[PDB]
Design a protein around this ligand. Sequence first.
Ligand code: HEM
Ligand SMILES: CC1(C)[C@@H]2CC[C@@]1(C)C(=O)C2
Ligand SMILES: [K+]
Ligand SMILES: [K+]
Length: 405
Amino acid sequence: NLAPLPPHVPEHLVFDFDMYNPSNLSAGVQEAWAVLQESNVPDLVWTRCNGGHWIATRGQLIREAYEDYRHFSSECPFIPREAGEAYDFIPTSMDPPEQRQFRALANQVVGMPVVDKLENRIQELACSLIESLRPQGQCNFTEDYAEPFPIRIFMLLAGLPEEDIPHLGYLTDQMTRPDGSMTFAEAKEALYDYLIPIIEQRRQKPGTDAISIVANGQVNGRPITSDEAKRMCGLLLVGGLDTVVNFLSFSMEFLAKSPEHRQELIERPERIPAACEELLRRFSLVADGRILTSDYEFHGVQLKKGDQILLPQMLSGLDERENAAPMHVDFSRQKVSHTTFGHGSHLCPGQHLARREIIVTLKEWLTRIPDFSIAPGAQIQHKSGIVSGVQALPLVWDPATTKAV
Ligand code: HEM
Ligand SMILES: CC1(C)[C@@H]2CC[C@@]1(C)C(=O)C2
Ligand SMILES: [K+]
Ligand SMILES: [K+]
């Protein structure tokens, strides 16, 4: 459904892209977003979908906008406006200078010290999961590996019972790829409602887990509050449950379709980190945005105070003006340009955990199950949203071609 074009928005710039159901979805979700970068399309368009908002279609604009928090505020970062307005997660709903004291804390609970401490656990789980599936000669990758591998590590990191995963994952899905069953507002409130007693408990009896660290944390050297803690913990939950999960599925689908790429990594495993970066570019999956703080002309376009602008992190790296042949996966790409983990002061702090989980997955899978394919006839469907994803991924393989390692 199309919202009436506001008086200030030039009609020639109208491109009715729907970020939650793009027209060319069947071609692939990155492919469907890439329609915004065909030859006839401007750098900055207005869609009347989802309440009406701007979309920057090119990496140069996306980067510039994320650097300029003065004009492009985090305070309303989701589309539609209702979701953006209800979105009060910490730190991402705050701009500098206010954001900063909270980000230091959030950066602590997922940073490299934490990851290295988890390295053994991550290793064991991946190998455990994969070795289980190996003689079976088949799996649904989304539920057999893509979900349980990162989620179990996160739940472990957070100190939360795995029993809760189906609920918490439903809530997170609705915030990024809504069913229609919940508003972002509703799902956010439910996640907050879950966390409240848990935070009170961790404050009374301080522990070593991510939630204890936040809940007992200090900001600017002063006591974080219960409300502040809730707002920060909920966001970590979203990060921990709905990013790597989805990226893993884009990567494995591709690897399942590309024997030559799998061979590359089988023969020269030392390339796996590079392959990781390139997959992060090619199958980049996040797209949120900002809200105009005041009337502002940006690349010859008059933006009005209150306007929302989608600034798709996904698109920077698929921009042919950043990467030649951007839809080709080249593990030896010399300059792998992307903004997959964001750009500007909100740049992802969990990226180290993401890379670790990615590289470990690539390394343990190809070592044990080097030869696999998509189940015959399966027509893989993607889903689009704040964070895009893969609906289902049935893999098959011959057990006789595997290695117990
Ligand atoms: C492939 C995996 C991931 C991708 C592609 C990704 C992407 C992003 C992007 C694009 C942003 C910026 C959002 C904005 O500017 O509005 C962001 C921020 C953030 N991410 Fe990641 N993320 C991933 C994994 C994770 C994980 C595993 C965690 C935590 C366990 C996490 C936690 C966070 C947090 C807390 C922020 C907010 C930082 C701030 O606002 O200062 N992310 N991420
Ligand atoms: C857009 C994000 C990936 C980033 C971390 C989780 C997420 C959904 C947010 O709300 C901020
Ligand atoms: K107009
Ligand atoms: K808000």
